[PDB]
UniProtKB/Swiss-Prot annotation, chain A:
Topology in membrane: Single-pass membrane protein
Family recorded in the similarity comment: Belongs to the complex I NDUFC1 subunit family.
Transmembrane segment boundaries: 14-32
Organism per entry: Bos taurus
Name of protein: NADH dehydrogenase [ubiquinone] 1 subunit C1, mitochondrial
Name of the encoding gene: NDUFC1
Signal sequence extent: none
Subunit structure: Complex I is composed of 45 different subunits.
Cellular component annotations (GO), alphabetically ordered: mitochondrial inner membrane; mitochondrion; respiratory chain complex I
Keywords: Electron transport, Membrane, Mitochondrion, Mitochondrion inner membrane, Respiratory chain, Transit peptide, Transmembrane, Transmembrane helix, Transport
UniProtKB/Swiss-Prot annotation, chain B:
Membrane protein topology class: Peripheral membrane protein
Nuclease keyword on record: no
Lineage: Eukaryota, Metazoa, Chordata, Craniata, Vertebrata
Annotated localization: Mitochondrion inner membrane
Protein name as catalogued: NADH dehydrogenase [ubiquinone] 1 alpha subcomplex subunit 5
Gene Ontology CC terms, in alphabetical order: mitochondrial inner membrane; mitochondrion; respiratory chain complex I
Keyword tags: Acetylation, Electron transport, Membrane, Mitochondrion, Mitochondrion inner membrane, Phosphoprotein, Respiratory chain, Transport
Swiss-Prot record, chain E:
Catalysed reactions, semicolon-separated: a ubiquinone + NADH + 5 H(+)(in) = a ubiquinol + NAD(+) + 4 H(+)(out)
Annotated compartments: Mitochondrion inner membrane
Species lineage: Eukaryota, Metazoa, Chordata, Craniata, Vertebrata
Protein name per the record: NADH-ubiquinone oxidoreductase chain 2
Organism: Bos taurus
GO molecular-function terms, A-Z: NADH dehydrogenase (ubiquinone) activity
Main location: mitochondrion
EC number: 7.1.1.2
Enzyme class: translocase
Listed transmembrane segments: 3-23, 25-45, 67-87, 96-116, 122-142, 145-165, 178-198, 200-220, 239-259, 274-294, 325-345
UniProt keyword terms in alphabetical order: Electron transport, Formylation, Membrane, Mitochondrion, Mitochondrion inner membrane, NAD, Respiratory chain, Translocase, Transmembrane, Transmembrane helix, Transport, Ubiquinone
Swiss-Prot record, chain F:
InterPro entries associated with the record: Deoxyribonucleoside_kinase, DNK_dom, NDUFA10, P-loop_NTPase
Species the sequence originates in: Bos taurus (Bovine)
Subunit structure of this chain's protein: Complex I is composed of 45 different subunits. This a component of the hydrophobic protein fraction.
Name of this chain's protein: NADH dehydrogenase [ubiquinone] 1 alpha subcomplex subunit 10, mitochondrial
Annotated localization: Mitochondrion matrix
Gene name tied to this protein: NDUFA10
Modification Phosphoserine, positions: S215
Length: 48, 114, 70, 115, 347, 320
């Protein structure tokens, strides 16, 4: 139950949580712009 | 009085709190002497000289003045002697030299010249 | 009848030094639990030297028997 | 040739002196005379017994330091290079790393002899 | 060992491997090998007990001898070619000496005797470095000189490694000796396909490293080094036993697990070269590896061996080992067969 | 920042926190010798952390809600059952002794962690170093087999090597006839069945094996019953000690970093308490083991790692 020693993970580590969410979001943006700019290069090069 | 830097004797460290250390050791000696019979000359003599040394420690708060009164060298030498006396008192309980002479010597054991 | 599970006799099949005993491995023991073998009981021997009597630093008649390590 | 002649003469003279030393003097050989010396009393054990080295760690470090000189001895020739910018950087780099290795062993008590 | 010293030494081990892999000059390749051996011995000796001392000495003697033969090959190559470039060797005697030198460095049979003993004598973390990272540098050199390697010599080592690795594992109860013999067997597959398609040597190497890294990481997690010590895992961490089972079956090459891929791809390459008898022999002999993987799954996951009373005290404490990358490696160790065509990236 | 190599690299080194009040004191003596009362006084006067002697439920107090767990989660080892039938067939005698040693080993690690992490000294009542006295008395009385004694030595041989002995060993030396009297006054019915031979085996183990060994590497203080009465006298002796021997003088930062890395990971500490040596006394089969283990995880706040149990009020689990 209520712990005699406070757990190491009793409270969220808000710094990791902020970074972890920021990394996931950052990569998704980078992947979408990267993908969207690969299509235009592919379309431009092949006459599309 | 400012604390010493050296006792002058090699291997004898300077004591930071001599008054308290002496009171502890003199009290312990008096405690150990309580287990020796009241009639033993070791108890009566050691208690007497112990109580005189303890009375000095309680009445002279200056280490320089106290050393002059105790006449036992540097106050760290006095602490060492107190420790030696306490060691002796415990040994004397086992030995019990207040008992009567264990054995007379032969007739002429100490006669000189022959 | 409840499901059989390995007992001590079964488990000890896997606790030896080897799975298949042979005469050449009869003297093998399992290694130490924590990988530490006992230090040797062997005593390292110190060099014993006569320092004097016939020696400039012995005053001519001191036989100083020294045990040296280096 | 000259060098080989010079070396042969040097060690030929030394050998001749040893030969003379061994065959000129009158000899009187017996067991007590040739027994091992140890201040008048018999040796206690063999002189071939192990003799502990207290400076063993310095001795190994000497092997590594003793090869720094081979890398540094070409420096007088390297100073004649056109590319002095690269030289001086690399020469100073080697000596500093040698100095750092010495400092590390020093600060970690590697130069203290074992008791 | 000061933590900073451990990192610098650990970075030097990687540096030597990287120097071998990026070097175009035989001298720098040899230097990279020496740098690697210099930095790994202190990791082997980390715990300073007689067994670790024995392992480090046996390792040093083996690796030093290989370096001598390797450098001898380089100088012979220099005599008969006047150049130092890392590539095919111009003298068949130089090819034999280098091939044997690399075989000792890998621990291939019959130069295998040191692998079981060194692995058993050192901690699990050190054994992980020895059986995974230390394979990269010698394999990368073999990947460049293979056009001049004698076919009979390289295939002879591969066949012997698979047999000796397979038979050696059957008698082991220590997990570090099981991983050593398993490593010897897997090295045989890598070099067997080397003359035909070097890409499948890289594929087998990577997949072997992922699966070996996972097994060592799970052994470290529960601090188990024997078959019986591992048999208690079910009573503390049930999940771990299931991961050990899946990883072990994958190491045995059972479809549809990732470990089947390198064996599958290597058989394809060998048959394309009308090599039928050898892949058939290899695949069957690898059943020896599966047999002593299946024993471990029996004592670990599919049955329950007896425990001890003191085990109850461990129920109250959580695992605190890092277990770095373990969730990712085990997924890669098991669920990659659907992605097999991705092997073309190695081309 | 959980302690590790990085925290050490950043300046969390033991030498920065120790003093001359950072000592590890152990109080020893036979049964009913006044250990626990003396131990509390020493800690109060010196400002040290007091550790009540480790019992069957010591590990319980350091985890969960701190309450004792049902005895099935300890193998049903029973101290009272040991005193009533010391020769029971189910191996209670050694199962208790093996469990108690592992409890002391866990406590010793917890004490060392507190000493190294905070620099505050601690006081213990017995320890892994003196637990063997009951092992010796049990065997000499025929309460355990010779096989059990060898098992105990194996576990101790691979566990006690990784630690440092206490700075100071206090020993309250009470004669056996006095203990037999004090046990009567105490009122514990089971404890009153202790025989004199057993107590004389504990005294013999102590005075003959423990104290000589501790003398060679620890400051050993011994006291009578009457001296032990006044903890002020005992504290005075401790405060004027020399500390000129033992391995604590040879410790440096990197060595204590390695020690701290061990004692903070409790599973690593307890690793060899469960070596697969199948004694009948301590062995348990899968069906019993599996059944109790499933019960253990059903206990409140025990199914998940501490901080991840909703049934005991832990929150933000989807962000942890
Ligand atoms: C899709 C393409 C890829 C195709 C390849 C195949 C994909 C599968 C690869 C699997 C990869 C490994 C991951 C497996 C996850 C297993 C999860 C599981 O079985 O439950 C764990 C359970 C834990 O038990 P519990 O105590 O309740 O919880 C503690 C953990 N919090 O554990 C237990 O309690 C069980 C203990 C008894 C052991 C039972 C052993 C027999 C059943 C094992 C089933 C899994 C077999 C995996 C082997 C590969 C199968 C293909
Ligand atoms: C832990 C690693 C430690 C690494 C430490 C490395 C220390 C190296 C310090 C720099 C040493 C050389 O420093 C550099 O020397 C060359 C001379 O050779 C100088 O160069 C100067 O002289 C050269 C020729 O002599 C001219 O061509 C050039 O026009 C002029 O700039 C540079 O102005 C100076 O910056
Ligand atoms: C680029 C070349 C020139 C640069 C100099 C390179 C060499 C530097 C040598 C190391 C200097 C610092 O490292 C050295 O560490 C030891 C720790 O044992 C220090 O302290 C020690 O040194 C001296 C002599 O041994 C002892 O009297 C002292 O008791 C001890 O504490 C030294 O005072 C310090 O000099
Ligand atoms: N078999 C066994 N019994 C133990 C052990 N430690 C304690 N006990 C028993 O647990 C009870 C309490 O131990 P003690 O502290 O020595 O007895 P006590 O009444 O508290 O006497 P004090 O020293 O004054 O505290 C006693 O019955 C001991 O015999 C042990 O390691 N093994
Ligand atoms: Mg008590």
């Amino acid at each position: 139950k209520f712990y005699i020693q406070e757990p190491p993970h009793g409270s969220p580590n808000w710094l990791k949580v902020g970074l972890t969410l920021g990394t996931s979001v950052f990569l998704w943006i980078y992947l979408i712009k990267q993908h969207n700019e690969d299509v235009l290069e592919y379309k431009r090069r092949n006459g599309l | 009085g400012l604390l010493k830097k050296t006792t002058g004797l090699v291997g004898l460290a300077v004591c930071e709190t001599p008054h308290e250390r002496l009171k502890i050791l003199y009290t312990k000696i008096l405690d150990v002497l309580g287990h020796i019979p009241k009639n033993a000359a070791y108890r009566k003599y050691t208690e007497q000289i112990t109580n005189e040394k303890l009375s000095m420690v309680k009445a002279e708060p200056d280490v320089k003045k106290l050393e002059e009164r105790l006449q036992g060298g540097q106050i760290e030498e006095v602490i060492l002697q107190a420790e030696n006396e306490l060691s002796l008192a415990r040994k004397m309980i086992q030995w019990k030299p207040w008992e009567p002479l264990v054995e007379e010597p032969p007739a002429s054991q100490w006669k000189w010249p022959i | 009848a409840r499901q059989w599970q390995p007992d001590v006799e079964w488990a000890e099949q896997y606790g030896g030094a080897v799975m298949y005993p042979t005469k050449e491995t009869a003297h093998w023991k399992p290694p130490p639990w924590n990988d530490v073998d006992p230090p040797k009981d062997t005593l390292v021997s110190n060099l014993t030297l006569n320092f004097g009597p016939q020696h400039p630093a012995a005053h001519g008649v001191l036989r100083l028997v020294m045990e040296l390590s280096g | 040739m000259n060098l080989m002649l010079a070396l042969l003469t040097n060690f030929t003279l030394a050998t001749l002196l040893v030969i003379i030393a061994f065959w000129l003097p009158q000899l009187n050989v017996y067991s007590e005379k040739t027994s091992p010396y140890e201040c008048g009393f018999d040796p206690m054990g063999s002189a071939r017994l192990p003799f502990s080295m207290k400076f063993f760690l310095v001795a190994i470090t000497f092997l590594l330091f003793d090869l720094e000189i081979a890398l540094l001895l070409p420096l007088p020739w390297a100073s004649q290079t056109a590319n002095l910018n690269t030289m001086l950087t690399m020469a100073l780099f080697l000596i500093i790393l040698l100095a750092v290795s010495l400092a590390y062993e020093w600060t970690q008590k590697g130069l203290e002899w074992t008791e | 060992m000061n933590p900073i010293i451990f990192i610098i030494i650990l970075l030097t081990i990687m540096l030597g491997t990287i120097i071998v892999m990026i070097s175009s000059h035989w001298l720098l390749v040899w230097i990279g090998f020496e740098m690697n051996m210099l930095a790994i011995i202190p990791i082997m000796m980390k715990n300073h007990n007689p067994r670790a001392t024995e392992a480090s000495t046996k390792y040093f003697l083996t690796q030093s001898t290989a370096s001598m033969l390797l450098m001898m090959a380089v100088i012979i190559n220099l005599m008969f070619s006047g150049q130092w470039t890392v590539m095919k060797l111009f003298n068949p005697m130089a090819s034999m000496l280098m091939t044997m030198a690399l075989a000792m460095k890998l621990g291939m049979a019959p130069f295998h005797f040191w692998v079981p003993e060194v692995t058993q004598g050192i901690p699990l973390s050190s054994g992980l470095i020895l059986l995974t990272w230390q394979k990269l540098a010698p394999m990368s050199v073999l990947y460049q000189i293979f056009p001049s390697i004698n076919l009979n010599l390289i295939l002879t080592l591969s066949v012997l490694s698979i047999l000796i690795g397979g038979w050696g594992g059957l008698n082991q109860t220590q997990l570090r000796k099981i991983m050593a013999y398993s490593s010897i067997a897997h090295m045989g597959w890598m070099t067997a396909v080397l003359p035909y398609n070097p890409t499948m040597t890289l594929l087998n190497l990577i997949i072997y490293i992922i699966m070996t890294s996972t097994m060592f990481t799970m052994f470290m997690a529960n601090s188990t080094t024997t078959t019986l010590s591992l048999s208690h895992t079910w009573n503390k961490t049930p999940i771990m036993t299931v991961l050990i089972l899946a990883t072990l079956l994958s190491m045995g090459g059972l479809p549809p697990l990732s470990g089947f891929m390198p064996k599958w791809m290597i058989i394809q390459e060998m048959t394309k070269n009308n090599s039928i008898i050898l892949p058939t022999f290899m695949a069957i002999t690898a059943l020896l590896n599966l047999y002593f993987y299946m024993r471990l799954t029996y004592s670990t996951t599919l049955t329950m061996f007896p425990s001890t009373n003191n085990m109850k005290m461990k129920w109250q404490f959580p695992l605190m080992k890092k277990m770095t990358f373990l969730p990712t490696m085990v997924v890669l160790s098991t669920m990659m067969l659907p992605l097999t065509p991705m092997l073309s990236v190695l081309e | 920042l959980q302690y590790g190599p990085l925290a050490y690299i950043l300046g969390e080194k033991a030498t920065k926190k120790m003093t001359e009040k950072s000592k590890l004191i152990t109080v020893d003596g036979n049964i009913c010798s006044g250990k626990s009362k003396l131990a509390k006084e020493i800690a109060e006067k010196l400002g040290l952390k007091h550790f009540p002697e480790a019992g069957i439920h010591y590990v319980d107090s350091t985890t969960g809600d701190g309450k004792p767990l049902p005895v099935q989660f300890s193998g049903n080892c029973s101290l009272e059952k040991f005193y009533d039938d010391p020769k029971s067939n189910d191996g209670n005698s050694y199962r208790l002794q093996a469990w108690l040693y592992a409890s002391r080993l866990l406590q010793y690690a917890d004490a060392l962690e507190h000493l190294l992490s905070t620099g505050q000294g601690v006081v213990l009542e017995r320890s892994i170093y003196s637990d063997f006295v009951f092992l010796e008395a049990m065997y000499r009385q025929g309460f355990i087999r010779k096989q059990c004694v060898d098992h105990y030595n194996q576990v101790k041989k691979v566990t006690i090597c990784e630690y440092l002995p206490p700075h100071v060993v206090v020993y309250v030396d009470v004669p056996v006839p006095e203990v037999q009297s004090r046990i009567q006054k105490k009122g514990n019915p089971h404890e009153m069945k202790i025989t004199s031979a057993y107590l004389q085996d504990i005294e013999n183990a102590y005075k003959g094996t423990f104290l000589p060994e501790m003398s060679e590497k620890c400051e050993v203080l011994q006291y009578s019953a009457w001296e032990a009465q006044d903890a002020e006298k005992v504290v005075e002796d401790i405060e004027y000690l020399k500390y000129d021997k033992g391995p604590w003088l040879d410790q440096n930062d990197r060595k204590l970093h390695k020690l701290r890395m061990l004692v903070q990971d409790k599973l690593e500490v307890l690793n060899y308490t469960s070596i697969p040596v199948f004694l009948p006394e301590v062995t348990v089969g899968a069906h019993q083991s599996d059944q109790v283990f499933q019960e253990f995880t059903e206990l409140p706040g025990r199914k998940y790692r501490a901080g991840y149990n909703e049934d005991v009020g832990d929150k933000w689990i989807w962000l942890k």
